[PDB]
Each structure stands twice: as structure tokens, then as C-alpha cells.
Design a protein around this ligand. Structure first.
Ligand SMILES: [Mg+2]
Length: 140
């Protein structure tokens, strides 16, 4: 009956959500290593988008294309929030290293511009328009 069928479904899929998060952990780790490699070398200058940010955004795009049909929408949103958190951590580290501060000066302006390219790229991907990226965190 419908009840027994669904009990079988429940048993078969009981770990589905937890296991997707575990595979997604490996994907976050891959992107985290890319961000560390790229952002450790980032220099603030025109033109924008900088080569660093073009590369980050291209890989984010390719990642989205690769997993779109493999993850439910909510998990894809959650994945991108984790990827974003990694990006912000590495960007914050580099801005601190370079002594770039949020004072409205030309250097701050260039980072704001590069980040606008990043945010625009991310939010233009299917399902990601209303992600709360909290990019202001990078100046903490
Ligand atoms: Mg300046």
C-alpha cells in the first residue's frame, strides 16, 4: 500500500540530505583552496574586474553549471553561502595584509568595484538572486 511504499522511500532516502552536505564539503574545500591561491596574490588596481576576480567568478559560474542538475535549489543556495563565506575570509585576510581600509579613497573604491562584479556575477546565477551575501563583513 501507499503507506508501506513510502516507509521504504523514507528508509532509502533517510540520509540523502546529510550525505549531499558531505559531498558538498569536498566542493567547498576545493573552492577554498582556489580562493586562498588567488586572493593571496591579489593586488588592488584597475581595470575592474581584476584578473583575480575574473578567474574567481568564472570558476563560480562553472561550478554552478556543473551542479545545477545534481542538487536541489535549497542545497545549491546553501552551497553558495558556504563558498561565499570562504571567499570573504580570504578576501578579508588579503585586504588586511595590504592595509586597505574602508575610507572611501581610491583603493577602497577599487575593491568596492571588484566586489560589485563578484556580487553581480553570483546573484545573476539561477536560484541565487536573493542570497544575503553580507559583503560589508570584509571590512570588519
Ligand atoms: Mg587610497
Amino acid at each position: 500500500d501507499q503507506w508501506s511504499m513510502l516507509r521504504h522511500f523514507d528508509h532509502i532516502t533517510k540520509d540523502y540530505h546529510d550525505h549531499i552536505a558531505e559531498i558538498s564539503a569536498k566542493l567547498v574545500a576545493i573552492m577554498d583552496s582556489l580562493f586562498d591561491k588567488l586572493l593571496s596574490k591579489y593586488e588592488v588596481k584597475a581595470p575592474v574586474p581584476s584578473p583575480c576576480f575574473r578567474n574567481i567568478c568564472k570558476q563560480m559560474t562553472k561550478m554552478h553549471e556543473a551542479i545545477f542538475d545534481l542538487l536541489p535549489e535549497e542545497q545549491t543556495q546553501m552551497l553558495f553561502l558556504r563558498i561565499n563565506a570562504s571567499y570573504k575570509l580570504h578576501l578579508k585576510k588579503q585586504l588586511s595584509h595590504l592595509n586597505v581600509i574602508n575610507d572611501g579613497g581610491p583603493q577602497n573604491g577599487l575593491v568596492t568595484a571588484d566586489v560589485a562584479f563578484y556580487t553581480g556575477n553570483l546573484q545573476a546565477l539561477k536560484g541565487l538572486k536573493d542570497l544575503d551575501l553580507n559583503m560589508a563583513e570584509i571590512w570588519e
